[PDB]
Ligand binder design. Structure first.
Ligand SMILES: Cc1cc2nc3c(=O)[nH]c(=O)nc-3n(C[C@H](O)[C@H](O)[C@H](O)COP(=O)(O)O)c2cc1C
Ligand SMILES: Cc1cc2nc3c(=O)[nH]c(=O)nc-3n(C[C@H](O)[C@H](O)[C@H](O)COP(=O)(O)O)c2cc1C
Ligand SMILES: O=C(O)c1[nH]c(=O)[nH]c(=O)c1CCc1ccc(C(F)(F)F)cc1
Ligand SMILES: O=C(O)c1[nH]c(=O)[nH]c(=O)c1CCc1ccc(C(F)(F)F)cc1
Lengths: 313, 313
């Protein structure tokens, strides 16, 4: 019994990969994820120019999860594109490149350059919609008219299948709106649910202080805090976008957690906080654990149970 | 050392109270909460007519928290108004009455009849905005125009200081907008942050099933999942609403959790999931624990540290 699957015209050894932003910023990080047992890897979301990001400390982790306000530190698009075009070994596993430009224009400029590399090498685009918006407005994926613009502009500029990284939603009307926006765009072939749960605040009781320096301590939450939010978003979009794939992200620490994402509808399962904490060895553990749950249940394939969460009456 | 507070022209022995919905639906519940060592109590969010609520199971709890889709089961406004006007022993502690009408008109009708009882007996109104409006639209506090309409109508109808129960927000632009709406209304004297984190999804791995029956298993999350979200909201409104009080709700299981709420800006601290799971004995434990942390730190009163969370550099 093995976990290999085929999606998006690519073959994957297993459904696991890193979450964007974790273990994927530098050449060393990408080589490390390539050497791991993960089924795929995704690069750090990039901007046109390099960024240093926010002042440290900017990430912290705890038993129940993590908080971050990294500020998009990255080596710049030219680097990630060169990695995709010249350095990545596609014989080892597929590559996703994540883009999060500061404007629609920036994204368009980056995607027009990525398109020939996608055609030649098969690198897959993940568009991070947790990105800056015009004054007074929330992040792009929380402004549905902005989202529709970005997707229209990217779809025209890129012209190839791509995916989108989504923040979580918390309201059924929002799920309905957001999924309807996505379903306007046939080139959006996968939706990754979810990014960090925004603008949480961790305070340390002893020091009476927040634990990260940017944004007066506020930052995105990941890890065990967010699993039920992640599962709800996965399933909500799985239900609403039958012609798309859903990739799950959030709160995966075990094969059981992966199993729950798959039951909710996930095709690929991304690992952020737990990977940052445990390191790339986590992928062998996750695979073993998931195969063990499958074996106990009599499942031979992922397709036997993907999306098959049961409801009551 | 002491936990006393004086606010809203009332005196409280300590900051602890139930969260609306928990241990507060029936007369038996309200007598229990009154007999407890909590500083105050709040009644179940009510509607004009009695409601049976959603089918069971509609609440479940687990090590990290709870999920619920109760559907507003309650005895009807006339019951809670009678409790306020004739049954509650105000010599024991203050009472809040929570309302959650299904339209603006329904809320107006209730607060019109609550006013004279508020003025004569000193019951305090908590208006639940994290609540259904037109189906297919977001909850009221996720629809800023609706929120403003509700607040204008209830302020005119009621004419006395009240407070509002808010859902969590996740985007800084939302914190800004939401606070700006609340700050239009001088009668809104307290803001309780937060109601449950909406539409999460808990799945049980063994049975491969969701754990609550309504809404295909989607429901609001409470407990350990939501403490950093709760803290963020408390602090965000604390900073943005300097002429109002903030009451904290979410993730309180210990005196330490309560101390973090208070550092964030909380005046009263409400207990939902943990009170549901432990029972009213939790209030003596929380009091003891909070007093122990105060003694270790040399704090004599709550004002010495309320809102005094430190930021980094
Ligand atoms: C340190 C850090 C940096 C991240 N940077 C990005 C990023 O560049 N792009 C992105 O799409 N998400 C980013 N995320 C969000 C993660 O991809 C993931 O959505 C989130 O952490 C939830 O998954 P988890 O519960 O496994 O951590 C970052 C997360 C962390 C912890
Ligand atoms: C069973 C149950 C019923 C609830 N009913 C209400 C309600 O009627 N009104 C309301 O404002 N909040 C209601 N809530 C939300 C809680 O008041 C509280 O905001 C939320 O549970 C988070 O706090 P916690 O982490 O301590 O559970 C309910 C929560 C639970 C668990
Ligand atoms: O780098 C981060 O802080 C981060 N952390 C997350 O948990 N999720 C993310 O998606 C991100 C990146 C968010 C982001 C995207 C784009 C900009 C920019 F255009 F200004 F560079 C900034 C931050
Ligand atoms: O009665 C509840 O379900 C409830 N639960 C909460 O966690 N917070 C609340 O404020 C409420 C009352 C408002 C309300 C009513 C109906 C629903 C539902 F139909 F989606 F279950 C949710 C929230």
């Amino acid at each position: 019994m093995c976990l290999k699957l085929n999606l998006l015209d690519h073959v994957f050894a297993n459904p696991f990969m890193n979450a964007a932003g974790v273990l994927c910023s530098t050449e060393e990080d990408l080589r490390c994820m390539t050497a791991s047992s993960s089924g795929a890897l995704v690069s750090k979301s990039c901007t046109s120019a390099p960024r240093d990001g926010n002042p440290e400390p900017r990430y912290m982790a705890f038993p129940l999860g993590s908080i971050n306000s990294m500020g998009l530190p990255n080596l710049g698009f030219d680097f990630y594109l060169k990695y995709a075009s010249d350095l990545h070994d596609y014989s080892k596993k597929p590559l996703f490149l994540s883009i999060s430009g500061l404007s629609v224009e920036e994204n368009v400029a980056m995607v027009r350059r990525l398109a020939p590399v996608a055609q030649e090498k098969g690198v897959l685009l993940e568009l991070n919609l947790s990105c800056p918006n015009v004054p007074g407005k929330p992040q792009v994926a929380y402004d549905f008219e902005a989202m529709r613009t970005y997707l229209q502009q990217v779809s025209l500029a890129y012209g190839l299948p791509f995916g989108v990284k989504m923040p979580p939603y918390f309201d059924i009307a929002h799920f309905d709106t957001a999924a309807a926006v996505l379903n306007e765009f046939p080139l959006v072939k996968f939706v990754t649910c979810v990014n960090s749960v925004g603008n949480g605040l961790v305070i340390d009781a002893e020091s009476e202080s927040v634990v990260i320096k940017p944004k007066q301590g506020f930052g995105g939450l990941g890890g065990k805090y967010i699993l039920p939010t992640a599962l709800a978003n996965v399933n909500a979009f799985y239900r609403r976008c039958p012609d798309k794939l859903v990739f799950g992200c959030g709160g995966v620490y075990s094969g059981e957690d992966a199993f729950l994402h798959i039951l909710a509808g996930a095709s690929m399962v991304q690992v952020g906080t737990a990977l940052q904490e445990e390191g790339p060895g986590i992928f062998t553990r996750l695979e073993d654990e998931l195969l063990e749950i499958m074996a106990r249940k009599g499942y031979r394939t992922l397709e036997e149970f993907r999306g098959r969460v049961k409801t009551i009456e």
